[PDB]
């Protein structure tokens, strides 16, 4: 995988590539990494794709019986509840997830839980394997407050290069953008985004 | 095993052949790998065989039940939800590779369910040893708004790639279409491209060929 | 240390016109050593036959699960339990151990005493259904048996010549595995008589 | 066990 | 916390009645009237929809339940105890049989086993008897048709034809006067309205009676097709307007 | 009848008597307050001087819950300390899953339902207090009031125990002479008056006062007991009034 | 807490008896009355229906005579429910004998362990004894032919003639009278038959009031076969003893 | 008489501490009444303060047990909060087992379930509510199902509960005789709102400010209640009408 | 009366009619007396005896070497209690390096004690209990009663007549609470504020017991000729 | 451990089992009775793991001693062996299985029959006109399978065992020390004692 | 197994 967050002026964006790997043979080339545990919290999967489904899963019904008692949940508290499955189940999961909503008193924000369980916060979030390769490029291009095209710009250069020199990334670049106007999927294709 | 599953216009069609396997030895030659979970909701199975059966067999008793304690249809999702579940709980050792496939009042629907529990939607779809033969018929071959014809033909087309160059694949094809508003069609040996030759000789023996030391009557009785 | 291999030992069951054959050897040895000439692998349940290949210890404790169950089944539906009903039980039952299961290859025969269509089935250790028109093999030498059926058999034989085919098969495929044969047993069933033939074979 |  | 209650509510008194059986049967007795008739060719079980209030939507309320393709039930009593039988029974026809043998339960032995639950709650610590009379038509291939009565106290017979709750004592002596081993299902059908209007007071149609049937296969109520040797379910619930062409035959 | 000899049974009226018996208990007991206010809350309570001997500030009886939230109750003390002590389990696990630190009307179904338990089963009693408890959450200030029953609702002012009327008329007050709302500081010294007011139906024994509360701008909505200066401010300022 | 509502099933009386187990056995005096009778060629099995109504469907019945394995029935008086219960468990109990020791079990051995589970619920547990005696009708290589009764004291003992449930001091006294040692079968059935025949609280004893049972070596030489009767067989062996 | 005190059978045939339940469905002494429009489901509830030292917005028998599903309580609030809370457990429960959410209808017979069991059960007590359970079904369409102490429920084209239960009741009898169909026949679920607050005036023979009400609505994918203001807002348009 | 029974009952006044009951076996314990200064704490304690050939039942127990207490009722009982006392204290050390505070020592009993008063099957707890104890802030005193309330105090007695003495020192209070660095004083006035409790007896050799704790002395007991000095 | 064999003939069965216990480089006994009276018509032999040989074996003991004295009867040979499959094949799957090998020979007074089981630590059972556990088999099953005839005498049976016995000390690695035999007829069990 |  190719996965990564982006938080801006408005809000965050999430974003990702669509293929699923079963050795080198791509079982799925159109996969949905980005998924929804509440309305505008979402996360981007990566590592073993039973492990992310079911933990998603799980998180996705505590946040359902938490709005039922107390309201909507802060983006904080989702990924509270990723970090403790995450954490307890640490010695058999193979789950790598980026945590990212928008809350009206916080806008964006961006969570990242590697492989131990650990959480951290940040102004943007890369993971997968095909983030390696864009560390160098992604540091020295990002800044805060960005604009939503210059967000969409960041992650579709970012995620081309991922995909380009990854081979365990490819297919469409699909991106979920969370601001205070609602939720917005967007796709990109290879036709577009390869040649930048 | 090849199996797939492709959508189509006002439904969804799963296909699969019809051989088993111990090692190289061709343990079935007409075995069915379309299961029914409910009237309307059918699944391919790949994998360890008797896991296939079994798991099958169990989320369809419980949807069953499920389906009467509501007074409703049953969803494929719900099929899928309890399947990826129990699989997921096995951390794999449960070896069954589905195609689930349906139709119910939110509509027609296609997934995949791999071993570990991860789930995949598509509107084509195929898994087992002649997935990759299947999937390159699939890839060249598929396209958006297909027929109900167009779907059986590119489905039993997909398995036959499987089973003539895949040696996990063989014999027959099945089919199952299940269309919204209608009832599920099972299409068992829809398709019977390997039928065995006429053999050249009879190897009926002379009576008495066998030679026997002793005979009695068996009691099956009361 | 392959429990499916240490006694050593074959089944197999064939179709006819109105009526199945099922035989099987009687060696039980231990490795090289041949132990008893006289270990019958075919067991049966009112008119429903059972052929049991594998781990013998696993074969006998299955025999004794099967006659319990099945006479339980008789005392509250007040029937014998058919071949299609008791190929679901044998079926339910070892999955029912799927992660420590019987190291068995059973194999199961009969006529449907009210349809009166002729019935066979296997299975492998962890319960899956192999229903056939034709044959059903098992054990150590079902390779051979494999070859022997595929080739021998023709559908719609009568009893008499079901038998010497059953019986070639299940002699020559013996012939061909060091672990089979010291004997052999062939039951031939019609709807209601069943005729038991022990046959003379090499005893090597 | 046998596979498909 | 937790249930201390670990002994039985239910025991013999002086003279050898068990108190909370009795007290349950008159529960029953209180029931609204049903009633099951056995035909050659089916079985026919039927009972009032008497609603709580006109507002109330009372198809929503299903007195009549299918428990197996081929296996039916009603009762009299109380409702509720009731509705968590039949998902006891629907549960139990599939574990302790279904998943063993790969078909359906007998009537008989499904039957039993409902039995033993309503036993059970004659006998396990801190519970009631279940306050209902069960009558459960069903059809196997073995043994045909059949139609049973089961009681709080866990006791099941056979029955050609009765009724239970209410005014099952008249109803039990229309039934003798009309039943013979000759009936067609459509005369057990005519009988079973007959002998419902008798005990029914107000509106009598197809939208205050529930009445449902063990017959023939239906093939169109499967909902697939390929499997020559799958049928269909033996079990149908006469709709609304099915009841009303029958009473203008009445 | 019998009805009133086993927790959990409904009379042919439909009450549990056994509550209402503990409400007895309840109403036996010395008086507590809760006041509602600006950015936050304020909780005092009348401790009954038995005796020379009783160390004077050392008997303390309201209770801090998490870091945010104080206690108050009226009635058997250590069923009152029983529920505190659940309502800090609550609390801590709420923290350890969510992270944030538990809402107030979050935390008082906690107490609710685990209060309402105890009127379900005849193996156990219901709980021989009311209790007042509140503090300051992301939504603001919140007061509740708990009663054995299980029952609980938010309150502008809150009293309970034998000083419970003689309060709730002087709460009353305040609530229609200050509609805009009552300052932290101002519901200190208030609650000293209302604690001494309705001391009056208590006054054989002469009592020991305490104060607690949470403010967003007094106490940066933590919960912090009121002494030294601040406490003899309200104290002189209760004096001033019933004289 | 809850002791207020205990009955205390398991308590002795002041003068040492077991007021459920009384009680029970009160209950089971108003059941229809079973008797079994053993002759020295084989047993039987008679027992009279709670009473009938036309319409209950008498041949594919069962509320007296049950099948226990291939060579013990029993009778039941009582509750049939609380009856199946105790039946399935002797049925499997029978089951776990033969698995282990591939014989049949020997009569007493199962009569005895069921006896010793009703015991048990006049001891502990503080439920409520099981409202049914049985008369076990059985052959085993051991003893030949014997009856047994169990009550819910789970005493057990065994007969050449015995009866339980309804009119049993009648019945125990008109067996008394007329059973002798040497008696066949054929002369016991008449013997039950006759007995119900006098004691019955009805009017006049007909087939569909009636279960019927033998257990014989009648089969094939050396071995046993037990013969539960059709209405229409017991209708002819009422004719055959002039009774109808 | 301790067939008295707990849930086993009387001599004739009846459980006392069921029916001693219902009594206390009663102890409020508020009414409420639903009914169904052609896109929604309304339900409306007395709301009375008695004590000026309330907050009168914490004062509420109305509850969102999931999106799509709402519930009012008639009894005290002790056990209509327990009831409220397993409800909301179970609706999440059944969307993570099944992957669909909870039909209003089928939650109904889960909580009707969970009570039966307290009636035949001996440690555990009835609750002594009704439950009205309300929603727009995917399948079914506006749905009123309503639970009590007994563990009965069923469907309902409008209801009403409380002590002045059945006049409302018989009202809304008259409409429905009168007007032949279903529901409300009712583009906006504001007028349905508006016609569920005029029918329970003429039936309680009451008027009412905006603080002695409170209302649910249920629209296709989600249940909300009202705030003072849109009441208010509502009770102005009848006024003018 | 009716509403006796057992501990998981309330009375119509809203009693707690086992726990009163428990209360009682309190009054007809042997006196006890407690008291403290700024430096030092001390327990006084009266013992019964069977008859003249009996030992005198120990009234003090030792929970730690700044903490310990003193008994009124049933004995098994304090056994019980100050036997968790010496787990808590001792967990409070092996976990965190920390001498256990009296005033937790207090909470931690009533709370185990309340227990017993709300659920079926238990008892209350049939005993009242002294401690003192040294520790960061101080000498204390707590008075434990099984209704689970512990109340924190400068001098207080428990046990039939201790009314005497709860009198006394009611009085006295000024002057005992500043004996500081004076041992002997202190224990002085406890003896002469359990004399008030006596009535046709007065303390002897064997039915008299003492205990001290504060600044530089470990909770020490003593019996017999050791307070023979103090008579 | 090491050798146990068993032979039945016309009348009674014979069980001879070593005398040998060996641990290491140290015969630490030459006078072992590897058996267990089960009853008094039965007789079990075993072989196999230390410890384990000796606490199946008494087990077993114990419990038919105990359904003899119940039910005041002497459970068939045929049933006896059933019961013991029964054990080791329940053992078989156990956390930790006994390793046992067992010959039970027995004298059926029903039917006035000597009776010989095989059966081994996995519980698999076989009767036998003769038997051996171990590698003894290896010499004897040929040697029996020349020499034995179904009809022989006891003492035709105890010549037969000489047979073994020195084929057995002649070609196996271990001095196993002697065998101590056993005879199970109509009378009962008895020793020969010198062998 | 299907990794990401
Ligand atoms: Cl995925
Ligand atoms: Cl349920
Ligand atoms: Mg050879």
């Not at chain 7, 105790?86 to 109990?93: D, E, K, M, S, W």
């Not at chain 8, 504001?190 to 629209?219: P, Q, W």
Request: glycine share 8%.
């Amino acid at each position: 995988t190719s996965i990564m967050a982006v938080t801006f002026k408005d809000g965050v964006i999430l974003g990702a590539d669509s293929r699923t790997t079963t050795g080198a043979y791509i079982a799925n080339r159109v996969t949905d990494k980005l998924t929804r545990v509440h309305d505008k919290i979402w996360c981007c999967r990566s590592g073993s794709a039973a492990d992310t489904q079911a933990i998603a899963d799980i998180v996705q019904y505590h946040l359902e019986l938490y709005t039922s008692q107390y309201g909507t949940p802060s983006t904080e508290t989702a990924a509270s509840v990723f970090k403790e499955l995450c954490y307890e189940n640490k010695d058999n999961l193979t789950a790598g997830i980026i945590v990212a909503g928008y809350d009206d008193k916080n806008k964006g924000e961006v969570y990242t839980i590697p492989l131990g369980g650990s959480v951290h916060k940040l102004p943007y979030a890369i993971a997968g394997s095909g983030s390696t390769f864009i560390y160098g490029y992604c540091d020295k291009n990002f800044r805060e407050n960005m604009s939503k095209e210059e967000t969409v710009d960041f992650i579709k250069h970012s995620l081309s290069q991922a995909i380009k020199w990854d081979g365990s990334s490819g297919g469409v670049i699909r991106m979920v953008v969370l601001t205070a106007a609602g939720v917005e999927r967007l796709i990109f294709y290879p036709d577009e985004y390869e040649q930048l | 095993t090849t199996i797939v599953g492709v959508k189509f216009n006002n439904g969804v069609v799963i296909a699969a052949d019809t051989r088993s396997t111990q090692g190289p030895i061709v343990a079935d030659k007409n075995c069915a790998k379309l299961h029914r979970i409910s009237p309307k909701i059918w699944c391919a199975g790949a994998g360890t065989a008797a896991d296939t059966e079994a798991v099958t067999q169990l989320i369809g008793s419980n949807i069953e039940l499920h389906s009467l304690y509501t007074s409703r249809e049953p969803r494929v999702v719900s099929a899928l939800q309890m399947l990826k579940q129990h699989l997921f709980k096995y951390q794999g050792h449960i070896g069954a590779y589905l195609i689930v496939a349906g139709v119910d009042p939110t509509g027609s629907h296609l997934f995949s369910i791999h071993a570990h529990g991860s789930t995949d939607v598509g509107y084509y779809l195929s898994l087992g040893s002649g997935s990759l033969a299947a999937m390159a018929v699939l890839e060249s071959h598929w396209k958006q708004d297909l027929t109900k014809e167009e779907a059986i033909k590119l489905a039993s087309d997909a398995i036959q790639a499987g089973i003539w160059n895949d040696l996990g694949s063989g014999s027959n094809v099945d089919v199952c279409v299940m269309e919204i508003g209608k009832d599920a069609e099972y299409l068992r040996n829809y398709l019977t491209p390997n039928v065995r030759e006429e053999k050249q000789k009879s190897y009926k023996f002379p009576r008495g060929t066998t030679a026997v030391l002793k005979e009695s009557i068996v009691n099956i009785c009361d | 240390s392959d429990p499916s291999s240490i006694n050593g030992g074959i089944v197999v069951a064939m179709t006819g016109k109105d009526c199945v054959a099922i035989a099987c050897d009687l060696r039980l040895g231990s490795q090289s050593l041949g132990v008893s000439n006289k270990f019958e692998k075919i067991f049966h349940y009112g008119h429903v036959f059972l052929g049991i290949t594998g781990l013998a210890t696993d074969v006998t404790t299955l025999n004794e699960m099967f006659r319990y169950k099945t006479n339980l089944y008789k005392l509250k539906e007040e029937r014998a339990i058919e071949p299609e009903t008791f190929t679901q039980l044998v079926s339910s039952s070892l999955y029912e151990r799927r992660f420590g299961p019987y190291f068995v290859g059973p194999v199961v025969a009969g006529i449907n005493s009210k349809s009166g269509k002729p019935f066979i089935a296997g299975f492998d250790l962890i319960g899956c259904i192999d229903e056939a028109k034709d044959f059903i093999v098992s054990g150590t030498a079902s390779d051979q048996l494999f070859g022997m059926c595929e080739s021998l058999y023709e559908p719609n034989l009568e009893p008499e010549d079901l038998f010497e085919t059953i019986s070639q098969a299940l002699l020559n495929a013996a012939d061909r595995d060091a672990l089979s044969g010291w004997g052999a047993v062939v039951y031939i069933i019609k709807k209601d008589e069943v005729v038991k033939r022990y046959l003379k074979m090499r005893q090597d | 066990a046998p596979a498909x | 916390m937790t249930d201390r209650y670990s002994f039985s509510l239910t025991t013999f008194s002086p003279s050898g009645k068990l108190g909370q059986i009795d007290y349950a049967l008159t529960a029953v007795k209180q029931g609204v009237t049903s009633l099951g008739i056995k035909a050659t060719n089916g079985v026919v079980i039927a009972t009032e929809k008497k609603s709580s209030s006109p507002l109330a939507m009372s198809e929503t309320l299903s007195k009549v339940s299918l428990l197996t393709p081929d296996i039916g039930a009603v009762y009299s009593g109380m409702g509720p105890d009731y509705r968590v039988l039949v998902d006891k029974s629907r549960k139990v026809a599939h574990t302790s049989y279904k998943r063993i043998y790969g078909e359906y339960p007998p009537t008989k032995l499904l039957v039993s086993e409902v039995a033993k639950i309503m036993q059970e709650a004659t006998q396990s610590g801190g519970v009631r008897p279940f306050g209902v009379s069960l009558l459960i038509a069903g059809h196997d291939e073995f043994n045909g048709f059949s139609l049973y009565q089961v009681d709080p106290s866990g006791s099941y017979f056979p029955w050609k034809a009765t009724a239970i709750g209410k005014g099952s004592v008249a109803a039990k002596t229309f039934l003798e006067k009309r039943w013979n081993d000759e009936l067609e299902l459509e005369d057990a059908i005519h009988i079973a309205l007959l002998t419902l209007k008798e005990s029914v007071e107000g509106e009598f149609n197809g939208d205050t009676i529930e009445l449902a049937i063990i017959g023939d296969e239906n093939p169109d109520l499967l909902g697939y097709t390929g499997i020559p040797t799958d049928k269909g379910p033996r079990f149908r619930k006469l709709t609304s307007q099915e009841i009303n062409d029958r009473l203008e035959a009445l | 009848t019998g009805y009133d000899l086993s927790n959990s049974v409904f009379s042919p009226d439909g009450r549990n008597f056994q509550v209402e018996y503990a409400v007895k208990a309840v109403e036996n007991g010395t008086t507590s307050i809760g006041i509602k206010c600006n950015d936050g809350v304020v909780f005092a309570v009348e401790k009954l001087i038995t005796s020379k001997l009783l160390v004077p500030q050392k008997n303390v009886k309201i209770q801090v819950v998490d870091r945010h939230i104080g206690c108050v109750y009226s009635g058997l003390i250590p069923d009152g300390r029983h529920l505190v002590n659940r309502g800090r389990e609550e609390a801590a696990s709420f923290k350890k899953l969510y992270k944030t630190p538990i809402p107030i009307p979050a935390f008082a179904d906690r107490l609710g339902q685990y209060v309402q338990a105890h009127t379900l089963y005849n193996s156990v009693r219901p709980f021989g207090v009311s209790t007042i408890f509140g503090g300051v959450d992301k939504n603001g200030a919140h007061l509740y009031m708990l009663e054995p029953s299980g029952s609980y609702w938010g309150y502008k002012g809150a009293a309970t125990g034998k000083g419970r009327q003689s309060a709730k008329a002087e709460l009353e007050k305040l609530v229609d002479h200050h509609p805009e709302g009552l300052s932290a500081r101002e519901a200190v010294k208030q609650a000293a008056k209302i604690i001494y007011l309705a001391h009056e139906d208590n006054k054989e024994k002469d009592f020991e006062l305490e104060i607690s509360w949470c403010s967003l701008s007094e106490t940066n909505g933590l919960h912090k007991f009121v002494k030294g200066d601040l406490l003899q401010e309200a104290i002189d300022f209760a004096q001033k009034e019933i004289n | 807490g809850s002791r207020r509502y205990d009955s205390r099933t398991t308590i002795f009386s002041p003068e040492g008896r077991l007021y459920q187990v009384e009680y029970a056995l009160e209950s089971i005096s108003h059941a229809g009355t079973a008797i079994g009778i053993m002759a020295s060629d084989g047993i039987v099995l008679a027992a009279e229906r709670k009473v009938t109504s036309t319409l209950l469907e008498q041949d594919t019945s069962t509320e007296k005579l049950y099948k226990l394995n291939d060579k013990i029935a029993v009778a039941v008086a009582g509750l049939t429910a609380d009856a199946e219960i105790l039946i399935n468990t002797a049925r499997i109990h029978a089951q776990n004998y033969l698995k282990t020791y591939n014989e049949d079990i020997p009569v007493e051995i199962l009569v005895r362990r069921l006896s010793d589970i009703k015991q048990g619920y006049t001891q502990h547990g503080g439920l409520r004894p099981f409202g049914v005696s049985f008369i076990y009708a059985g052959y085993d290589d051991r003893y030949g032919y014997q009856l047994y009764t169990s009550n819910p004291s789970g005493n057990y003992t065994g007969w050449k003639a015995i009866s339980v449930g309804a009119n049993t001091s009648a019945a125990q006294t008109l067996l008394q009278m007329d059973y002798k040692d040497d008696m066949k079968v054929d002369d016991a059935i008449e013997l039950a038959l006759k007995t119900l025949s006098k004691t019955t609280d009805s009017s006049a004893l007909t087939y569909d009031r009636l279960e019927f049972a033998t257990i014989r070596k009648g089969a094939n030489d050396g071995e046993v076969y037990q013969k539960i009767f059709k209405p229409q067989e017991i209708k002819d062996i009422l004719v055959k003893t002039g009774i109808t | 008489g301790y067939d008295r005190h707990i849930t086993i059978f009387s001599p004739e045939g009846r459980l006392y501490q069921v029916e001693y339940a219902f009594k206390a469905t009663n102890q409020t002494n508020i009414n409420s009444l639903a009914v169904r429009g052609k896109d929604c489901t309304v339900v409306i509830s007395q709301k009375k303060v008695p004590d000026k030292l309330l907050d009168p917005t914490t004062v509420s028998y109305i509850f969102c047990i999931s999106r799509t599903i709402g519930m009012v309580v008639n009894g005290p609030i002790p056990d209509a909060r327990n009831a409220a809370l397993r409800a909301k457990a179970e609706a999440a429960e059944f969307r993570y087992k099944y992957g669909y959410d909870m039909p209003c209808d089928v939650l109904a017979k889960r909580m009707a379930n969970l009570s039966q069991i307290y009636t035949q059960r001996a440690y555990m007590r009835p609750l002594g509510v009704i439950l009205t359970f309300v929603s727009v079904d995917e399948e079914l369409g506006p749905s009123i199902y309503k639970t009590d102490p007994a563990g009965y429920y069923v469907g309902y084209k409008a209801t009403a509960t409380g002590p002045k239960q059945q006049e409302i009741t018989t009202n809304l009898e008259n409409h429905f005789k009168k007007s032949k169909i279903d529901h409300i026949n009712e583009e906006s679920w504001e007028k349905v709102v508006e016609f569920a607050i005029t029918h329970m005036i003429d039936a309680l023979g009451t008027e009412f400010s905006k603080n002695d009400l409170e209302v649910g609505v249920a629209t296709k994918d989600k249940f909300f209640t009202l705030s003072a203001e849109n009441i208010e807002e509502r009770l102005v348009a009848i006024a003018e009408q | 009366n009716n509403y006796d029974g057992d501990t998981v009952t309330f009375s119509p006044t809203g009693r707690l009619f086992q726990v009163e009951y428990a209360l009682e076996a309190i009054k007809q314990g042997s006196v006890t007396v407690g008291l403290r200064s700024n430096t030092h704490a001390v327990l006084v304690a009266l013992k019964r005896n069977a008859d003249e050939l009996s030992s005198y039942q120990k009234k003090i127990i030792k929970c730690d070497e700044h903490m310990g207490l003193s008994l009124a009722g049933l004995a098994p009982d304090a056994r019980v209690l100050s036997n968790y006392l010496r787990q808590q204290c001792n967990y409070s050390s092996l976990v965190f390096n920390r001498k256990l505070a009296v005033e937790r020592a207090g909470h931690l009993l009533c709370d185990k004690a309340q227990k017993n008063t709300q659920s079926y099957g238990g008892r209350p707890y049939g005993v009242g209990l002294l401690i003192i104890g040294y520790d960061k802030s101080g000498a204390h005193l707590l008075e434990f009663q099984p209704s689970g309330n512990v109340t924190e105090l400068y001098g207080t007695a428990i046990g039939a007549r201790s009314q005497g003495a709860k009198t006394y020192l009611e009085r006295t209070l000024d002057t005992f609470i500043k004996i500081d660095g004076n041992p002997d004083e202190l224990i002085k006035a406890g003896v002469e504020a359990i004399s008030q409790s006596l009535r046709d007896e007065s303390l002897t050799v064997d039915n008299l017991s003492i205990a001290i704790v504060g600044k530089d002395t470990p909770f020490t007991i003593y019996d017999g000729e050791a307070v023979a000095k103090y008579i | 451990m090491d050798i146990i064999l068993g032979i039945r003939v016309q009348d009674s069965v014979i069980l001879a089992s070593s005398k040998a216990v060996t641990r290491g480089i140290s015969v630490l006994k030459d006078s072992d009775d590897k058996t267990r009276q089960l009853s008094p018509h039965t007789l079990m032999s075993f072989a196999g793991e230390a410890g384990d040989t000796v606490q199946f074996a008494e087990y077993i003991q114990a419990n038919i001693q105990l359904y003899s004295i119940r039910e005041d009867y002497e459970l068939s040979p045929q049933a006896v062996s059933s019961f013991v499959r029964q054990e080791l094949a329940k053992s078989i799957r156990s956390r930790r299985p006994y390793q046992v090998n067992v010959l039970i020979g027995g004298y059926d007074k029903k039917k006035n029959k000597p009776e010989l089981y095989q059966i081994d630590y996995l519980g698999t059972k076989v009767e036998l006109p003769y038997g051996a556990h171990g590698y003894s088999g290896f010499y004897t099953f040929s040697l029996l399978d020349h020499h034995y005839r179904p009809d022989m005498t006891t003492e035709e049976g105890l010549d037969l065992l000489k047979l073994c016995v020195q084929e057995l000390e002649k070609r196996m690695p271990m001095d196993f020390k002697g065998v101590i035999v056993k005879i199970v007829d109509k009378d009962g069990i008895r020793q020969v004692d010198d062998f």
